[PDB]
Amino acid sequence: PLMVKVLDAVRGSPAINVAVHVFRKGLTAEEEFVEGIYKVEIDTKSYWKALGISPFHEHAEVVFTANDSGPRRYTIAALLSPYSYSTTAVVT
């Protein structure tokens, strides 16, 4: 007998993030996984990935240049952070 109890009795206004998982039992291959339940990606860059089988096989001339240079601003308050009876403010 497998028995799981999470947050059986709750009272008084909480702020919660819950994730419960119960289990009982070519270039890239993956099998029966769980990925990115709570994931935050910001300013993620990928350039070349899995081009293919035998690319640029013979006599290839490649010039690769990656320029990542710009005025960018990211302002975040309370990222993945639950709060209660509090105050959050962003002033510019």
Determine if residue 25 is labeled as part of a ligand binding site: no
Distances (CA, A) of 35 to 26, 42, 49, 80: 21, 17, 19, 17
**At its nearest, how many Å lie between its own copies and the CB of residue 34?**
5
Binders in 7-46 for its own copies, by CB under 8 A: 7-46
At 37, phi and psi to the nearest 5? -65, -45
Determine if residue 54 is labeled as part of a ligand binding site: no
**At its nearest, how many Å lie between its own copies and the CB of residue 59?**
5
Provide the annotated binding site for L-thyroxine.
Answer: 5, 86
